[PDB]
Amino acid sequence: MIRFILIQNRAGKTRLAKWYMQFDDDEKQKLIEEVHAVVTVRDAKHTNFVEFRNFKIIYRRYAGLYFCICVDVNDNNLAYLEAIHNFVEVLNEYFHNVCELDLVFNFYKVYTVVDEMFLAGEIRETSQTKVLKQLLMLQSLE
Amino acid sequence: SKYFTTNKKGEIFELKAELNNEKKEKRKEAVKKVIAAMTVGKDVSSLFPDVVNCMQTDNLELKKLVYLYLMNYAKSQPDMAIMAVNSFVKDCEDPNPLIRALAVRTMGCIRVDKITEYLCEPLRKCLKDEDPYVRKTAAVCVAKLHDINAQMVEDQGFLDSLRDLIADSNPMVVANAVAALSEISESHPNSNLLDLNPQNINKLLTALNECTEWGQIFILDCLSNYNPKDDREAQSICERVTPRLSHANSAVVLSAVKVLMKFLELLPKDSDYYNMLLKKLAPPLVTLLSGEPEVQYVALRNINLIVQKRPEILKQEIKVFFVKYNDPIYVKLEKLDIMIRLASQANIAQVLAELKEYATEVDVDFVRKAVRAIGRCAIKVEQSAERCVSTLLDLIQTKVNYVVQEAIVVIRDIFRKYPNKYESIIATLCENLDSLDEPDARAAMIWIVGEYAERIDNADELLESFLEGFHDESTQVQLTLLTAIVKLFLKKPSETQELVQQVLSLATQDSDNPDLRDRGYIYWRLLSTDPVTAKEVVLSEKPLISEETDLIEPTLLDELICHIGSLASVYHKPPNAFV
Amino acid sequence: DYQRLN
Amino acid sequence: GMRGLAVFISDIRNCKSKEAEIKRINKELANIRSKFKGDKALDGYSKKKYVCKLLFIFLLGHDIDFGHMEAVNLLSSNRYTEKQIGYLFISVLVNSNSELIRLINNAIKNDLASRNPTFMGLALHCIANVGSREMAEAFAGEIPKILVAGDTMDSVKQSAALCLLRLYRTSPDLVPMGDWTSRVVHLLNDQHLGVVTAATSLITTLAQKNPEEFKTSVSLAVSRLSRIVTSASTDLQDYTYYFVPAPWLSVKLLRLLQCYPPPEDPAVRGRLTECLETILNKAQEPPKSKKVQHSNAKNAVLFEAISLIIHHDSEPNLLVRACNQLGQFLQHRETNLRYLALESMCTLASSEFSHEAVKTHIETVINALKTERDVSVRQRAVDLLYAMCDRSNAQQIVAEMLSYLETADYSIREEIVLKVAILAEKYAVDYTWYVDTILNLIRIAGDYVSEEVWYRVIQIVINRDDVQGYAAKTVFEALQAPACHENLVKVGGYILGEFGNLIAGDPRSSPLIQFNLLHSKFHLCSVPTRALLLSTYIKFVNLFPEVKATIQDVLRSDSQLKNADVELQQRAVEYLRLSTVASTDILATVLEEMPPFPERESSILAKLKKKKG
Amino acid sequence: MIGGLFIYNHKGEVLISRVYRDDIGRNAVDAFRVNVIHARQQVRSPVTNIARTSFFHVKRSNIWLAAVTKQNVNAAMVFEFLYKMCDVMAAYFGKISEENIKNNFVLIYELLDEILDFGYPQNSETGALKTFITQHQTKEEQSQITSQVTGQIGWRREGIKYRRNELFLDVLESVNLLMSPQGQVLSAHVSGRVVMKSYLSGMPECKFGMNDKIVIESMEQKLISEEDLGKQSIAIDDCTFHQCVRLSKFDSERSISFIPPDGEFELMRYRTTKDIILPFRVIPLVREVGRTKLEVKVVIKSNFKPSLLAQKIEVRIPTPLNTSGVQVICMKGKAKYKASENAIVWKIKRMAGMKESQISAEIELLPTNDKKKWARPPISMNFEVPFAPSGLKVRYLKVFEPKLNYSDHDVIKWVRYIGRSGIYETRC
């Protein structure tokens, strides 16, 4: 399963965080700051999978942006790297050309869309369509 | 004010792109960006060829920054590290001596197995020069070389060249020469150190004056090695050196002490330069707990050793080593121990005061160290002991587990100095024992219940409790519990079948531990002969202890003396548990 | 403040 | 849309030091406390806008202490965006309150008991998103009855499945096992691939704890898969990621068969083979898109397939080919793919069908480990040799790990030392190489050794004989070495202790010399070690009349007798006493040879398994 | 010697890093980041070993400064070096901070490389370095800098000329005192330093001396002058010096004679205990009312001459490990308290020569254990006073320059006497 989802920026600002069981506070802050310590230091010829202790995080870049998923060990690395990207694509759809200020200024959409394609620590919807359908056909009215 | 930093996208490639520019400005700014990212951690070998192609210049900021990148990656690609040869060998030939020197020092930093040979001649004609900046660099380079690929015969031309360098027109020269010629006298063709005598030593001392901070420290940390023929040498050397109410502070001062502390062999009470020397050596050694914190902690480690080796120096400076509440912990613990070194016939009253005050503190390590200390005071002189023991009992009864435990440990070492005395306590101790979950606590407590079992009709229940999970208990626990039980048995055989039984069994039949199994066995091959020789062997009366409270091994010590300035002292271990 | 030396 | 949030954030971004941020912030916080407290508290943009601003401040890195009931407001509602906003703030934050909690649940069921998409939806997303016990206490016979013989919106069906997976995720006791199993594994087959997805996941856990229960899932997941993998080059276009068909569904079904050992009914097992075969062969094929993602989706499937193959062990051919492919992958331009093959083929090596199959690649791996130079990677490589080792290998694999240890961290150092020790113990043909290799770890590492390693090499030298006069020799030359580790002194100590007689003939090794040597070693040595050198000193007495003078001379001077520590006292005394008193014929009888150790249990492997994870 | 040398920001990133030796790794810099900068186990020491590598470090700002070796270097030395370094970086731009460091890469390096080679520290000063380190010439300047750096007066001399020709000596003296429950000086000492700020010309030979035992009997002589037999003339427990004083010549003649650095350099450290002047007496007592009141009392007294000015008064008094309801009173200055950090701090502006001031406190009591008590930490003081707490005063400063014409009589010479805190205890 998914333990969690992060979207961090270059700076360290947690432009998204998102959790999937019991967790703490000072804990979550640590998780984050050290996730960052890992990810920001990497590069091209480094794997988008990093093993840490008794979990592993699958992690991808975009501009100055780090979309991270931390997950179990028995889990499907590639699969998850691609989940990340497919989702990033749906947002590229939604904001019809997405950059981070989009997720800042519209963080709640973001939350509700992640919710739309991740639940209980699992994959909800893979379809670029069915997501963008329900997303927009119920975006329609306030 | 012009930094660069940042990371991402693929700007290492973009970095290559602008690293190849027409206007030298986008290139300079490039090399800088590169070093910045090299310093943060990025992999930038991917750029090597281009950056060294930049080193092909005459502007010093850039030359320098390239040179940096050059050390650092030059090792891992000998292949394109070919690049520099012509540039450096031409630079080793410059107008500007600073440029020659930057060349020579950058050069010998690149360890590629044929750069050795390409520099060999620049360096040979560099250890000669109408410039001491050069020659400074040249000696340092010879050491730098001897670290890689270097035994070399020409390289022996360099050895000689380096030794002849010592006796120079210049200080800096000789600082780096002495320094080098010493770092080198590691590689052991047994003939290490190489030389030093009359001329060498006299020249070296006049240097000791006319040199620099560090240069000096190099002359002391060198000198801590000369073996003076008689005592003429001993004296005029100790004196020639003496002046070290000095400056590099710590360093010169400590080395001063290292060298100085060494030439104490000349029969304990001579025309007592010896004792003027014993006076002389305490003032500075005290000033030292008045540097920044750091150089205190180093100074204290060093003292603690000195006090141990020669205790008649800070004999009644005991006052000095009293603990302030705003000394940083490490200085605290050092101090405390150095107090208990000196505690004697006089100081005890206020000492026990101070200690009684420390226990009350919150830093757990401190608290303990001091409760220990009290106990250790008991062992140092007796009267003390009665009052100490009492305070300690009180202390146990303060119900705080770890203080309980440290208490127990000490109290054992006490019974071991005062057998036939504090027997009365044991039942007490035993009540609050079932909460000793530390190794030394169990060790001491079990050795106790072992020892004084005749007293303790209870002991069957206590030891046979301990045998539940006999494994997953410290070897020191086990080992100690074992001798403890054969002890019990020997004295109380009428109740101890199943006990030497199952201890002997456990010890002998399953222990992966060789020393344990092996001792399981050695105590089976006695209780299978004679009490006659069993009693005679185990329960034999065992000599006392005396003035000793956690001393360091005597010889070990003799050699940590030889290692005063050096981490050895700090760590209190020969240089061999760090290669 | 200070006071003259000499 | 709505104005404020944009204004606010614009401004909050357009700031000075994080403190001016804090000023503006606390201005809005006090302004919201006071926009809250009293008056005609408005509807849309007002409640939405400000609740949204509290969420944003919270999620800026600040805290919210106040008016969250004055936010629980929005839940049961006319508008979506107020519902969504309310649910959002409540899922993102839950404080020290219970009244709140029961009002939130009230809103939950009073919103849930509807007949349309986003209500059912938003609430399910909440329950599944956070929720305390009362969610699983009050809604645990709820979701099963949601999906029994009863049909809802696919989006809802989905959120329902995943919700129930949440409610089994934290409250097993509070999960009933009713007659709904059949429509769970009927609506697996079901049309919508999202439904199939979630279901596949849930069913994966449920059957992870209850195999017998979903024994139907099998066949259906099978046909569903083979269907997915060979359909047509344009099939269910909605559910193809960069040209690959439904890869996370495949991957989730692959994962779903891995809880079941080799499929029974053999037409099923047939299709499964035939298919896995297919998958394998499609990896054979060529890139259908230059774009890295396509490649990846495909490989995800391939990798999970390989895995189902390994978990099975019923296919020899399949295994061999998984090896072959994984083989091709180890030198890939891509790093994820090397690293993933390495991992995978390590997992693989435990099947004996593929063991020579694997061995072939030794060259490659020894090269990765020697070269790669990232490290996650080499760690995978070294795990893979250790993995692939038998007798032949063993000789080389060991030589290699030994240099490899001439360079690594701390953690790794120890674990490598542990493996080199288990390989050389398990595989040594000649046992002089075994002593040599252990003596080697001590040299290259020492500080990292562990202890079951020196206990074991000790153990072994005693138990083998033929090994001994050699061991003794070695250990003696090796002790007289210059810089000199301590476990060498533990080991040489013991060994030369209880076998020094074998070597004792040679003028270079008389016993005097053995002692003096061990003795320069003594004076810098942890207690336990010195306990060792003492007891050797007594073996050395009884095995060596010759010397006894010097030995007693030593274990008699104050230093060891008036010693500060119990063991070295007890000992120094006891051994004094058995030279002193002791018939001879007793001393002897005591210090006998020392029986062979039984064939133990292997502490070492034990340690390594404890280090695992 | 010195192998690694690495500087970090507080969050854990490198800022600058420079390796003089093959021994060291990427490993090193990490490990330190990993192990000192990050171990949940704060309490340490300042040297470490990780895995046959030793790591020293200082903290400045919140900015860590590490040096690394894999030999048995001289402890002390490498430390003194990190010190000398921080002084060189201030020397170049004062504030040692993340932004201040980052925005200076190229320098720091040119330095690092200069200051210290192959781990062997070189010429470390700042009056050498300022002369050949940018932030342009020939053989002249060239061999000038060369022979100056290599020579015996590196440390800050070349060929110097000033528009206004002056020197200031500052006597800065810390009073370190630990004083038992009810007044008795258990640790009674003063640690002093002579900070000399000198703007001079050329190669000016200084001699120097203080109070040290004699008996008595221009066109700007003082008006009054003593005569009356100035006894108690005080001699110095121990003095250590600066790099410039001819310690051979001193050991011999007991003169303090040198050629000085330009600017604000520290000339000697020294300590005294004998015929010591008393400082600032602290009287601390705690009492009880009912089963629910613990009441705390601090009285402050001062020991001056009649006429004088006690400055920047700060008093630290502890609350019990926890505090119920604090109640604080003052009779001069103003009162400060801080909670969760748990302590009480009194701040006083001005205190006259030989005063007496009261400070009060109250703390409520409700059940915290089952019958367990507290143990009171020492009460601690911070201050500035214009006496010279030892009773030192500068007797003389000879200033002979052979090159230029001028000598002693031409020099504006100012002296200050400042008496700072340091270490200052009790409540028992």
Short mmCIF file of N, CA and C in Angstrom, two decimals, chain D residues 21-89:
data_model
loop_
_atom_site.label_atom_id
_atom_site.label_comp_id
_atom_site.label_asym_id
_atom_site.label_seq_id
_atom_site.Cartn_x
_atom_site.Cartn_y
_atom_site.Cartn_z
N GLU D 21 5.07 37.71 6.98
CA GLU D 21 4.18 36.58 6.74
C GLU D 21 3.38 36.29 8.02
N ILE D 22 4.09 36.04 9.13
CA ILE D 22 3.45 35.80 10.46
C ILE D 22 2.51 36.93 10.92
N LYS D 23 2.93 38.18 10.70
CA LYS D 23 2.13 39.39 11.00
C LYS D 23 0.82 39.39 10.23
N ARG D 24 0.94 39.43 8.90
CA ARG D 24 -0.22 39.34 8.00
C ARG D 24 -1.14 38.15 8.38
N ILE D 25 -0.50 37.01 8.65
CA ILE D 25 -1.18 35.77 9.06
C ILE D 25 -2.02 35.95 10.33
N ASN D 26 -1.36 36.30 11.43
CA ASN D 26 -2.06 36.50 12.71
C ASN D 26 -3.11 37.61 12.63
N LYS D 27 -2.86 38.58 11.74
CA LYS D 27 -3.88 39.57 11.36
C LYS D 27 -5.12 38.88 10.80
N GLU D 28 -4.92 37.98 9.82
CA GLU D 28 -6.06 37.20 9.31
C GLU D 28 -6.67 36.22 10.31
N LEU D 29 -5.86 35.71 11.24
CA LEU D 29 -6.32 34.78 12.28
C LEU D 29 -7.22 35.46 13.31
N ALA D 30 -6.76 36.60 13.84
CA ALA D 30 -7.57 37.43 14.74
C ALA D 30 -8.79 37.99 13.99
N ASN D 31 -8.57 38.44 12.75
CA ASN D 31 -9.65 38.89 11.86
C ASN D 31 -10.72 37.82 11.57
N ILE D 32 -10.30 36.55 11.51
CA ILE D 32 -11.23 35.42 11.34
C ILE D 32 -11.91 34.99 12.65
N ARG D 33 -11.17 35.00 13.76
CA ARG D 33 -11.78 34.85 15.10
C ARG D 33 -12.92 35.87 15.30
N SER D 34 -12.65 37.13 14.91
CA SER D 34 -13.65 38.23 15.02
C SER D 34 -14.70 38.30 13.88
N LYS D 35 -14.36 37.78 12.69
CA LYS D 35 -15.34 37.62 11.60
C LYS D 35 -16.30 36.47 11.96
N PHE D 36 -15.76 35.49 12.69
CA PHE D 36 -16.50 34.42 13.34
C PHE D 36 -17.46 34.96 14.40
N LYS D 37 -16.89 35.41 15.52
CA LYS D 37 -17.64 35.72 16.76
C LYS D 37 -18.75 36.80 16.66
N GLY D 38 -19.98 36.35 16.39
CA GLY D 38 -21.18 37.21 16.37
C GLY D 38 -21.85 37.41 15.01
N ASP D 39 -22.73 38.42 14.94
CA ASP D 39 -23.29 38.95 13.68
C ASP D 39 -24.01 37.98 12.73
N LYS D 40 -24.41 38.52 11.58
CA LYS D 40 -25.14 37.81 10.52
C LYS D 40 -24.18 36.98 9.64
N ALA D 41 -23.68 35.86 10.18
CA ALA D 41 -22.63 35.02 9.53
C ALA D 41 -23.04 34.36 8.20
N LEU D 42 -22.54 34.91 7.08
CA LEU D 42 -23.08 34.69 5.72
C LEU D 42 -23.00 33.25 5.16
N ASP D 43 -23.32 33.13 3.87
CA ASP D 43 -23.42 31.83 3.20
C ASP D 43 -22.15 31.36 2.44
N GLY D 44 -22.12 31.55 1.11
CA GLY D 44 -21.10 30.91 0.25
C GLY D 44 -19.64 31.36 0.33
N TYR D 45 -19.28 32.33 -0.51
CA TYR D 45 -17.95 32.97 -0.50
C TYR D 45 -17.36 33.26 0.90
N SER D 46 -18.21 33.64 1.87
CA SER D 46 -17.80 33.93 3.27
C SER D 46 -17.26 32.71 4.04
N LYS D 47 -18.14 31.74 4.30
CA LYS D 47 -17.78 30.45 4.95
C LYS D 47 -16.72 29.67 4.18
N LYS D 48 -16.98 29.47 2.88
CA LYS D 48 -16.04 28.81 1.98
C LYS D 48 -14.67 29.52 2.09
N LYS D 49 -14.61 30.77 1.60
CA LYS D 49 -13.41 31.64 1.62
C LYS D 49 -12.60 31.59 2.94
N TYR D 50 -13.26 31.90 4.06
CA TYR D 50 -12.54 31.91 5.36
C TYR D 50 -12.11 30.49 5.89
N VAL D 51 -13.01 29.49 5.85
CA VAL D 51 -12.62 28.11 6.23
C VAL D 51 -11.39 27.66 5.41
N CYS D 52 -11.50 27.88 4.10
CA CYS D 52 -10.40 27.71 3.16
C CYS D 52 -9.13 28.43 3.63
N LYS D 53 -9.27 29.68 4.11
CA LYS D 53 -8.10 30.41 4.62
C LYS D 53 -7.46 29.81 5.88
N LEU D 54 -8.30 29.25 6.77
CA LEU D 54 -7.79 28.50 7.93
C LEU D 54 -7.05 27.21 7.53
N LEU D 55 -7.67 26.42 6.65
CA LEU D 55 -6.96 25.28 6.07
C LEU D 55 -5.61 25.75 5.52
N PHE D 56 -5.61 26.75 4.63
CA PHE D 56 -4.34 27.24 4.05
C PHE D 56 -3.29 27.67 5.08
N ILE D 57 -3.70 28.44 6.08
CA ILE D 57 -2.75 28.82 7.15
C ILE D 57 -2.20 27.58 7.85
N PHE D 58 -3.10 26.67 8.25
CA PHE D 58 -2.70 25.40 8.85
C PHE D 58 -1.64 24.73 7.97
N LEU D 59 -1.97 24.56 6.69
CA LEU D 59 -1.10 23.92 5.73
C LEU D 59 0.03 24.81 5.24
N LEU D 60 0.20 25.98 5.86
CA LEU D 60 1.39 26.80 5.58
C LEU D 60 2.53 26.37 6.49
N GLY D 61 2.17 25.83 7.65
CA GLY D 61 3.14 25.40 8.65
C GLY D 61 2.83 26.03 9.98
N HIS D 62 1.59 26.53 10.11
CA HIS D 62 1.07 27.13 11.34
C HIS D 62 -0.06 26.28 11.90
N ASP D 63 -0.58 26.66 13.07
CA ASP D 63 -1.62 25.87 13.73
C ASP D 63 -2.94 26.59 13.94
N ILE D 64 -3.98 25.77 14.07
CA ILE D 64 -5.34 26.22 14.20
C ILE D 64 -5.89 25.66 15.51
N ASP D 65 -6.36 26.57 16.35
CA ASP D 65 -6.83 26.25 17.69
C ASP D 65 -8.33 26.45 17.88
N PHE D 66 -8.96 27.20 16.97
CA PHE D 66 -10.29 27.74 17.23
C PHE D 66 -11.36 27.42 16.19
N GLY D 67 -12.62 27.69 16.56
CA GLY D 67 -13.77 27.60 15.67
C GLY D 67 -13.61 26.60 14.54
N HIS D 68 -13.81 25.33 14.86
CA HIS D 68 -13.85 24.29 13.85
C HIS D 68 -15.27 23.71 13.79
N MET D 69 -16.09 24.03 14.79
CA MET D 69 -17.54 23.78 14.73
C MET D 69 -18.15 24.82 13.78
N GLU D 70 -17.77 26.08 14.04
CA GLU D 70 -17.96 27.20 13.13
C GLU D 70 -17.22 26.94 11.79
N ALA D 71 -17.15 25.66 11.41
CA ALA D 71 -16.59 25.15 10.16
C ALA D 71 -17.22 23.78 9.78
N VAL D 72 -17.51 22.97 10.82
CA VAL D 72 -18.34 21.76 10.68
C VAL D 72 -19.72 22.16 10.15
N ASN D 73 -20.11 23.41 10.42
CA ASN D 73 -21.19 24.08 9.67
C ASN D 73 -21.51 23.45 8.31
N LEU D 74 -20.60 23.68 7.37
CA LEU D 74 -20.80 23.51 5.92
C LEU D 74 -21.28 22.13 5.41
N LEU D 75 -21.15 21.08 6.24
CA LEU D 75 -21.25 19.65 5.81
C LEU D 75 -22.54 19.15 5.12
N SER D 76 -23.62 18.89 5.90
CA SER D 76 -24.95 18.65 5.31
C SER D 76 -25.34 19.95 4.61
N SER D 77 -25.44 19.93 3.24
CA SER D 77 -25.55 21.19 2.51
C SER D 77 -26.30 21.10 1.19
N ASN D 78 -26.68 22.44 0.68
CA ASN D 78 -27.28 22.58 -0.64
C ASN D 78 -26.22 22.52 -1.72
N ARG D 79 -25.09 23.19 -1.47
CA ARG D 79 -23.98 23.31 -2.42
C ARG D 79 -22.95 22.16 -2.30
N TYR D 80 -22.33 21.80 -3.43
CA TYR D 80 -21.18 20.89 -3.42
C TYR D 80 -20.01 21.54 -2.68
N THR D 81 -19.52 22.67 -3.20
CA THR D 81 -18.22 23.25 -2.79
C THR D 81 -18.11 23.50 -1.29
N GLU D 82 -19.25 23.78 -0.65
CA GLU D 82 -19.30 23.89 0.81
C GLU D 82 -19.14 22.50 1.48
N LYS D 83 -19.83 21.49 0.94
CA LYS D 83 -19.66 20.09 1.39
C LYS D 83 -18.19 19.66 1.28
N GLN D 84 -17.66 19.79 0.06
CA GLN D 84 -16.26 19.46 -0.26
C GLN D 84 -15.30 20.21 0.66
N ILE D 85 -15.51 21.52 0.80
CA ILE D 85 -14.67 22.33 1.68
C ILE D 85 -14.72 21.85 3.14
N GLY D 86 -15.93 21.57 3.63
CA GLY D 86 -16.12 21.11 5.02
C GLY D 86 -15.49 19.76 5.31
N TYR D 87 -15.87 18.78 4.49
CA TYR D 87 -15.21 17.48 4.50
C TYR D 87 -13.67 17.60 4.43
N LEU D 88 -13.17 18.49 3.57
CA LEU D 88 -11.72 18.72 3.41
C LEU D 88 -11.07 19.20 4.71
N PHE D 89 -11.56 20.33 5.24
CA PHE D 89 -11.03 20.83 6.53
C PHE D 89 -11.13 19.78 7.65
#
